[PDB]
Amino acid sequence: MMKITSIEVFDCELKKRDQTMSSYNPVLIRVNTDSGLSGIGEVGLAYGAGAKAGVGIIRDLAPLIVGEDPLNIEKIWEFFFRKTFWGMGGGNVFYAGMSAIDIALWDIKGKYLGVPVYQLLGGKTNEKLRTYASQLQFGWGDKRHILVTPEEYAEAARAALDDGYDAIKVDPLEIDRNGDDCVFQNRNRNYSGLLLADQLKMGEARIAAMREAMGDDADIIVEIHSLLGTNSAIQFAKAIEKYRIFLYEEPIHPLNSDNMQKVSRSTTIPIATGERSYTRWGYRELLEKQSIAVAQPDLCLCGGITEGKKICDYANIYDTTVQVHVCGGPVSTVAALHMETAIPNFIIHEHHTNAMKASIRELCTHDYQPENGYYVAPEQPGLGQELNDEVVKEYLAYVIK
Amino acid sequence: MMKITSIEVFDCELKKRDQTMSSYNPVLIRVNTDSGLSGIGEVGLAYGAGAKAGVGIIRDLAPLIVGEDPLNIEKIWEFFFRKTFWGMGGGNVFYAGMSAIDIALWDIKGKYLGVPVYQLLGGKTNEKLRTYASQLQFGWGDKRHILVTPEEYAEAARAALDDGYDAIKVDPLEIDRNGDDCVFQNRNRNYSGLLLADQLKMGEARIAAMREAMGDDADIIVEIHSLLGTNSAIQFAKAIEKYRIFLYEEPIHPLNSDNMQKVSRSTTIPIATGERSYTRWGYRELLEKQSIAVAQPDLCLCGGITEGKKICDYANIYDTTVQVHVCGGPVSTVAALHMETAIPNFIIHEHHTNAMKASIRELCTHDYQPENGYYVAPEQPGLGQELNDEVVKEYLAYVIK
Amino acid sequence: MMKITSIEVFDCELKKRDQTMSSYNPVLIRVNTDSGLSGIGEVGLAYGAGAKAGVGIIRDLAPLIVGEDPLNIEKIWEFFFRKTFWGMGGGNVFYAGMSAIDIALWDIKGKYLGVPVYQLLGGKTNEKLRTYASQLQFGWGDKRHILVTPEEYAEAARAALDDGYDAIKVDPLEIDRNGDDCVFQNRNRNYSGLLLADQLKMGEARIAAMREAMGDDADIIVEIHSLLGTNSAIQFAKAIEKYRIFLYEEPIHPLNSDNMQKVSRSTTIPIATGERSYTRWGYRELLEKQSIAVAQPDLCLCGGITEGKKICDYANIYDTTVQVHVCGGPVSTVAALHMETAIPNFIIHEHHTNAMKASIRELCTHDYQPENGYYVAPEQPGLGQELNDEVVKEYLAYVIK
Amino acid sequence: MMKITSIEVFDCELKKRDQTMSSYNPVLIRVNTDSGLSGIGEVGLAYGAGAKAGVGIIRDLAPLIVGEDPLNIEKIWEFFFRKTFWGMGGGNVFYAGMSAIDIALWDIKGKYLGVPVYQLLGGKTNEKLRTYASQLQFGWGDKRHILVTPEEYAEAARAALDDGYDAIKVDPLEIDRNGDDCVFQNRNRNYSGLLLADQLKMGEARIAAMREAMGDDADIIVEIHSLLGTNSAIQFAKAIEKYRIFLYEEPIHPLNSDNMQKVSRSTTIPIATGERSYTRWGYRELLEKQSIAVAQPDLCLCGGITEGKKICDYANIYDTTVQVHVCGGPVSTVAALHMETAIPNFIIHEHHTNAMKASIRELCTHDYQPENGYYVAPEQPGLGQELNDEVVKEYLAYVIK
Ligand SMILES: [Mg+2]
Ligand SMILES: [Mg+2]
Ligand SMILES: [Mg+2]
Ligand SMILES: [Mg+2]
């Protein structure tokens, strides 16, 4: 019945509207059909080096589905995987392109069938979703800032708890002594080997101050952003084990799965990873080797809602539970909410400190925010979001038709 | 001393100048310095879905090295790997971006030191490079089109041998009975399970015709483009073993390394793969599991000349030899020539049936072609290639500065 | 262009000039060409039983390259590995001979192209190199003698920290209660089974006093010289874990790689080894079994600069960082400096307590010493050293031509 | 009561007395005592690059045992292993030094106790020793030269059979079409990857001609000299399986033990190796991985008679039988004979094609040769050999005292 007619790509250079958001660049899409139904998706490359590559991949993929039936979601996914060459040897950019399209197709399918996406994923398994305040090294607040001292870290923790959260995530090593950012700047390159006394102390003092301010019951997730190597990851874990750490996220990159297993066998802190792992194939070795307690696929990278569901289902057989990685526009948030509502192995939801920024919220028509440390799913047909056209018109980059 | 001043990106939509090359789109770069020395690179996404993403990644990566010293090649490489977020969770597009820049930096360094790149890679190890005629399902020489019948395959084989080659590569399953292309069209989807009788016979009859036309001594490489799955790959290998097959290329994709090992253990034909494997980390499980005889990294995808050399050095300890994957512009060709000249574990060089096309050759100022089945290295400083400005001006897409 | 014309071998029997240096016997070489460019190298057998074998292996290897083009460094390396019989079943002596030659060729190539060796290895990755004060069981500074009591070890530690180091290495079990040396004398043979109470107390008391003298921040590397066996290596590690040990070096010999793995799994102190491990092939089992945090190839043993770099590149994929082993003449020091400057996985640099000895220094024309705990690379073309002909004339043992 | 007084080292440059033996250079020692008893030994580096290194290692090791009691053979061995630094990371040269001294000490102990060495090794287990004619690529008997054509190979085979041998060994790939020698010349470098058709035919034609000339009952050992890599080793084995091959020797080098296992699992021809494998530690991974049917330690390399016996005893538990590697002077021959007479897991004895050369035989006072394809042990006290001082005075290089 329906056919895809066009795909709009939005290159959301947020610096155009808010200079505090200088680096951040969500990439959003809208898939239109000849029935009048449209669906929105997101390419999960809003931070780091990749936004322009993300726009480009939609230009490479979208032409293949113009004129095609949007309802054959498995077929479309499999075509991208099998018949594009790169589908069988992809990566963050290629799978992100597949993801954005997949999400927009689920949106269309939900609207067509008149139900929220979680209904098509298996129904309302989880009525409310425990949520954590994410990345407190950038503070907890409306704007806030790069935090350096343990007291500043403790204050962000107190602010998260006052806001109703009973779980927080922090990278205690990302920010160096001078307030520089080791994720994106050439600082503390020795992190990949072994930590120096001062660095160990810097990270531990921040965690220690946060635990003290939070009390014992609230949970702390320690994020590492793959800054450490196998040996420093273990060295640091042993320093922070005394603080009862809930999860250890991305203690090393996922490119060597045997090293990930080694880290997991070497600390009592359960390991989380997944934002930089894509497709069921990207999880096979992590799961088989029993290296992770929590999988963190980004639905805007891992292959979308179709593949994301499959990742969750697979993780379940290894007792691996799921926290969707969410750090982008409002589309990533609703995709995650529908997924986490339906899956039986949901553990916790990530609410990023930037998700409250006006320049991010204004990209879409609805605001979905946690209340008292919990999220609920949207209830309208499809994803329950639309692009805010008054804003996104400034960001329109390409229309594929 | 020197600083990078700008990076030009060329989106080589060949269809603008030659309609017959419609779905081929090399992506080239030029890195310019304040000394007047320039270097050229290539993003290895000339086919499949990815050219526009490849243009985009250069826009994402290039701004990070404007103003920087081009001579610190290991440092620039490591910074892209470590400090961009996605470098540690990359893929074909991200590592292609890194590759192009790296190749351009080697070009600069060679010109700066007054010697060809092979000298910087360890000197002249191989004086001449045995070369094969690549992808004969698309014909050789005069008759350039999709081949279907066994006699058409035998004719292409004779033509390659007439052209002085003593080795060919063919995918005998890519083209179906009707002349449709299974790599890029939804045809023969059952390929990934088990082959039907007609398909097995189709493939084997083409190989039979070619062996018969070539005599027993010339080598046949069977390319599969990852079209088969574990079970059908083993199935077909058994049907073609009798023809004395030199290598079996990409019998399945590389996303499940345990399946690759199983294929390797189930056929006597040695396995080759690597065009969809990136960086040392992408080879670790293939080599450790002793799954491949020959590695085929593409220097325009795998992380460039710096990482390519490292992959070759690594392969060597497993008795794995190297044929660089070459299927793009003239930049990929010279990058490969220098690599293969320097490495001790070189096996054979790939000469693609398209590398003789006018619209590819005109991209660069020099023509380097094999003679009597052998290649030799360029001898000028750097890569020994320049872009043909008269042509590439039509393709200039972005200038980063 | 050029041909190798002659190779000089210097049997540097230091006792001929300095009776205090009696055991020590650096072996140096100079490779001369018909262009007037010469390069120097070193065979890394200055201590233990091996110096005269080291002179001999150059007599065996050098004739093979007289008249050959020195720039083909990979080709020369591969020839020695492949076509001498013993290259494929070598060991400390054979690979040491290859090493010396390889280092001299890098010197030549740097000179010819007019740049320091680090530029040919990939550029200036590390602008300065953190350095440790090495082998404090023989004192530091004013006191140049065999240390016995915990208080003496504490005094050495203070001296090093006063000299501006923030890291030290000590072997706390090498010297017995009577001041005898278990590395070279038949004492404490029970070390390779299980330690006796007094021995355990002896070692731990020395570490305890050093940690107390140093404060908590400075790093301690514990050197074992392969004196312990698997079971005593673990037993001692558990006794010294409480002092926060940075690395545990050569806890056992590397001849049984499974035992090395077992030691690494049985202590939380990260393992370093590599001075008695040669070529890529000598690290394969160490790396694959994930047994080492730090690789310590000696560039004058492991196969030279060409093979050393490949070892560092390989190490990196297992998050193994590099401290080159340096305990010889000034040639070893500069080869290490160039290597450590270029590699992204450098961790720390070894400065031996004997490196300031007049009889070692006078072998060469320049001095390169650390300052405030840091080394920088030479900046001259090639290695940045020449032989001091007024001294080495008396060590000249052979001229191969 | 006895003490070692001196150690003479003989650098047997046979070219001084015989130009046809041009490069071949046995290295012999004699260990003298204050009791007037002396023992002789050999450093196993007579061919390839290493004889001068072999002379040097005796100069390094011998001083350590002057004044010591020769009878403590395990103690001396263990001291060289443990207290020399390099003993715990040695290789062919270092362990050859140990070996020569060890063999000399067994000679002494046998003379002291009035019995042949085989008595001290466990008595007369094997009364006669099946012997094969070794290295027929260099002809046999009347026609001693480099063989190229299959007819030449068949003729050497007949000659050996007419000489009373029922087993032969040949390397069918060492000599190229032009009579060049791939073991010591840069020829057929592609051997380490995959064989070309011509090379496969060349090798198989030579084996085919020998089998046809020999009949079906006589055994053929195929020697490869580690010239092949894992992939070509398997490729070649498949082509010659039809000729009923007794053993496949050194199909690849022993530096990657996982590759050796792979080769062993991929051909039905039983594998032999060991001449480039030293000490018990050098056989551990070969044995544990069940990669070898026959172990071939050289007693003049592997650690001598003490360690050789331990290697034989270890091999036994894996059903691995022993052929001692013998290609040196007459001392190597008698050490082998004694060992093989005593061990229960002897399989076959190697009789080298140059064993009857005048310049080889004249080094020693006795001549032990096979008859009708069988060797027997010497029956004199000790090894049953003395040096021929009239000849070896011309070769004396050093006397350590
Ligand atoms: Mg994260
Ligand atoms: Mg291919
Ligand atoms: Mg050491
Ligand atoms: Mg042999």
Dihedral angle, C-alpha B140, B141, B144, B150, nearest 10 °: -30
- Chains with 3+ CB–CB pairs under 8 A to B are A, C, D
CA nearest to B174 within chain A:
A83
A259/C290 CB distance under 8 A: yes
Query: How far is it, in rounded angstroms, from Cα A147 to Cα A159?
Result: 13
A363 in Cβ contact with A12 (< 8 Å): yes
Q: Which chain A residues are within 8 Å of C290, Cβ to Cβ?
A: 230, 258-259, 262
Q: Is C350 helix (H, G, I), strand (E, B) or coil?
A: strand
User: What distances in angstroms separate CA A227 from CA A239, C319, D223, one per listed residue?
Assistant: 16, 11, 51
Min distance A101 CA to chain B CA atoms (Å): 14
Query: How far is it, in rounded angstroms, from Cα C97 to Cα B122?
Result: 19
D89/C52 CB distance under 8 A: no
Q: What is the 3-state secondary structure (H, E, C) of C166-200?
A: CEEEECCCCECCCCCECCCCCCCHHHHCCCCHHHH
Query: How far is it, in rounded angstroms, from Cα D212 to Cα D157?
Result: 10
Neighbours of C204 (CB within 10 A): 18
B7 sits in which H/E element: strand B4-11
D388 in Cβ contact with D364 (< 8 Å): yes
Tell me which residue in B216, B219, B319 faces D230 most closely, judged by beta carbons. Answer: B319
Q: Which chain B residues are within 8 Å of D192, Cβ to Cβ?
A: 319, 321, 345
Query: How far is it, in rounded angstroms, from Cα A206 to Cα A136?
Result: 11
Cα A199 to ligand 2 centre (Å)? 47
Residue with tokens 């001043």: B5
C62 sits in which H/E element: none
Proximal ligand: closest to the CA of A44? 1
How many residues appear in chain C? 401
Interface of A with B in 208-267 (CB under 8 A): 225-226, 253-257
Q: Which chain B residues are within 8 Å of D234, Cβ to Cβ?
A: 268
Beta strands C167-170; C219-223: pairing state: parallel
Residue with tokens 């599969």: B224
DSSP assignment letter at D182: T
Q: Which chain B residues are within 8 Å of D252, Cβ to Cβ?
A: 319
Q: Is B239 helix (H, G, I), strand (E, B) or coil?
A: helix
D57 in Cβ contact with D93 (< 8 Å): yes
C219 in Cβ contact with C167 (< 8 Å): yes
Query: How far is it, in rounded angstroms, from Cα C319 to Cα C322?
Result: 10
Give the dihedral sign, CA B378/B383/B384/B390.
positive
D362 sits in which H/E element: none
A308 in Cβ contact with A314 (< 8 Å): no
* Residue D396: exposure state from Cβ atoms within 10 A (0-12, 13-18, ≥19): middle
- Strand-pairing partners, residue B350, are B132
Buried b (16+ CB within 10 A) or exposed e, D286-297: bbebebbbbbbb
B133 in Cβ contact with B351 (< 8 Å): yes
Query: How far is it, in rounded angstroms, from Cα B393 to Cα D58?
Result: 71
Q: Is C28 helix (H, G, I), strand (E, B) or coil?
A: strand
Query: How far is it, in rounded angstroms, from Cα D301 to Cα D328?
Result: 11
Beta strands D294-295; D321-322: pairing state: parallel
Query: How far is it, in rounded angstroms, from Cα C244 to Cα C247?
Result: 9
Neighbours of B73 (CB within 10 A): 25
Annotated binding site of B: 223, 249, 275
Tell me which residue in A192, A194, A256 faces C270 most closely, judged by beta carbons. Answer: A194
Q: Which chain C residues are within 8 Å of D27, Cβ to Cβ?
A: none
Phi first, then psi: what are they for A171, rounded to 5°? -95, 110
Cα C250 to ligand 3 centre (Å)? 7
> Is the Cβ of B313 closer than 8 Å to some Cβ of chain C?
yes
B284/C344 CB distance under 8 A: no
Nearest to C250 by CA among C308, C190, C302, C296: C296
> Is the Cβ of C199 closer than 8 Å to some Cβ of chain B?
no
Beta strands C219-223; C247-249: pairing state: parallel
Query: How far is it, in rounded angstroms, from Cα B313 to Cα D193?
Result: 14
B42 in Cβ contact with B328 (< 8 Å): yes
A185/B57 CB distance under 8 A: no
Within 8 A by CB and 6+ apart from A296, the residues are A249, A272, A273, A274, A275, A322, A323, A324, A325, A350
Tell me which residue in C216, C270, C318 faces A197 most closely, judged by beta carbons. Answer: C216
B74/C344 CB distance under 8 A: yes
D134 sits in which H/E element: strand D129-134
Query: How far is it, in rounded angstroms, from Cα D284 to Cα B58?
Result: 51
> Is the Cβ of A88 closer than 8 Å to some Cβ of chain B?
yes
Nearest to B307 by CA among B71, B78, B45: B78
Nearest to C327 by CA among C383, C276, C387: C276
Query: How far is it, in rounded angstroms, from Cα C223 to Cα D334?
Result: 43
Resolution of this structure in Å: 1.8
- Chains with 3+ CB–CB pairs under 8 A to C are A, B, D
Phi first, then psi: what are they for D30, rounded to 5°? -135, 125
> Is the Cβ of A92 closer than 8 Å to some Cβ of chain B?
yes
Using left for φ > 0, alpha for ψ between -120 and 50, and beta otherwise, residue B51 falls in alpha
Within 8 A by CB and 6+ apart from A356, the residues are A142, A369
User: What distances in angstroms separate CA A70 from CA A113, B123, C154, one per listed residue?
Assistant: 13, 55, 75
Nearest to A343 by CA among A116, A131, A118, A132: A118
Tell me which residue in B216, B270, B319 faces D259 most closely, judged by beta carbons. Answer: B319
- Chains with 3+ CB–CB pairs under 8 A to D are B, C
Size of interface A-B (CB pairs under 8 A): 173
CA nearest to B184 within chain A:
A83
Give the dihedral sign, CA C85/C87/C89/C95.
positive
Nearest to C100 by CA among C4, C8, C25, C3: C8
How many residues appear in chain B? 401
Min distance B346 CA to chain D CA atoms (Å): 8
Query: How far is it, in rounded angstroms, from Cα B328 to Cα B24?
Result: 8
CATH 3.20.20.120 in chain A, residue ranges = 115-382
- Known binding residue C379? Answer is no
Indicate the CATH number for domain B1-114+383-401: 3.30.390.10
CATH 3.30.390.10 in chain B, residue ranges = 1-114+383-401
Query: How far is it, in rounded angstroms, from Cα D23 to Cα D19?
Result: 9
Query: How far is it, in rounded angstroms, from Cα D214 to Cα D220?
Result: 9
A196/C219 CB distance under 8 A: yes
Within 8 A by CB and 6+ apart from B201, the residues are none
Neighbours of D388 (CB within 10 A): 15
Query: How far is it, in rounded angstroms, from Cα C90 to Cα C149?
Result: 41
B59/A45 CB distance under 8 A: no
A188 in Cβ contact with A182 (< 8 Å): yes
Tell me which residue in C219, C270, C344 faces A231 most closely, judged by beta carbons. Answer: C270
Residue with tokens 């020099």: B366
Q: Which residue type sits at D110?
A: G
Q: Which chain A residues are within 8 Å of C217, Cβ to Cβ?
A: 197-198
Query: How far is it, in rounded angstroms, from Cα A43 to Cα A94?
Result: 10
Q: Is D293 helix (H, G, I), strand (E, B) or coil?
A: coil
Residue B35's Cβ-side half-sphere holds a number of Cα atoms within 13 Å equal to: 16
Annotated binding site of B for Mg(2+): 223, 249, 275
Residue with tokens 């006794």: C239
Phi first, then psi: what are they for C274, rounded to 5°? 150, -15
Q: Which residue type sits at B31?
A: V
A86/B281 CB distance under 8 A: no
Interface of A with B in 342-401 (CB under 8 A): none
D337 in Cβ contact with D326 (< 8 Å): no
- Known binding residue C275? Answer is yes
Neighbours of A213 (CB within 10 A): 19
Query: How far is it, in rounded angstroms, from Cα A255 to Cα A325?
Result: 18
Interface of C with D in 33-62 (CB under 8 A): 45, 47-57, 59-61
Q: Which chain C residues are within 8 Å of A194, Cβ to Cβ?
A: 246-247, 270, 293-294, 321, 347
Query: How far is it, in rounded angstroms, from Cα A196 to Cα A228?
Result: 12
Residue with tokens 């890519």: B174
Nearest to C166 by CA among C246, C223, C99: C246
Query: How far is it, in rounded angstroms, from Cα D354 to Cα B27?
Result: 63
Q: Is B103 helix (H, G, I), strand (E, B) or coil?
A: helix
Which homologous superfamily does the CATH classification assign to the domain defined by C115-382? Enolase-like C-terminal domain (3.20.20.120)
Query: How far is it, in rounded angstroms, from Cα B38 to Cα B101?
Result: 12
Which method was it determined by? X-ray
Q: Is B290 helix (H, G, I), strand (E, B) or coil?
A: coil
Tell me which residue in B75, B125, B281 faces C78 most closely, judged by beta carbons. Answer: B125
B76 in Cβ contact with B101 (< 8 Å): yes
C269 in Cβ contact with C245 (< 8 Å): yes
Query: How far is it, in rounded angstroms, from Cα A239 to Cα A245?
Result: 11
For chain D, how far is it from start to end, CA to CA, in angstroms?
18
Query: How far is it, in rounded angstroms, from Cα C60 to Cα A160?
Result: 72
Annotated binding site of D for Mg(2+): 223, 249, 275
Q: What is the 3-state secondary structure (H, E, C) of chain A?
A: CCCEEEEEEEECCHHHCCHHHCCCCCEEEEEEECCCCEEEEEECCCCCCCHHHHHHHHHHHHHHCCCCCCCCHHHHHHHHHHCCCHHHHCEHHHHHHHHHHHHHHHHHHHHHHCCEHHHHHCCCCCCCEEEEEECHHHCCCCCCCCCCCHHHHHHHHHHHHHCCCCEEEECCCCECCCCCECCCCCCCHHHHCCCCHHHHHHHHHHHHHHHHHHCCCCEEEEECCCCCCHHHHHHHHHHHHHHCCCEEECCCCCCCHHHHHHHHCCCCCCEEECCCCCCCHHHHHHHHCCCCCEECCCCCCCCHHHHHHHHHHHHHCCCCEECCCCCCCHHHHHHHHHHHHHCCCECCEEEECCCCCHHHHCCECCCCCCECCEECCCCCCECCCCECHHHHHHHEEEEEC
Using left for φ > 0, alpha for ψ between -120 and 50, and beta otherwise, residue B56 falls in alpha
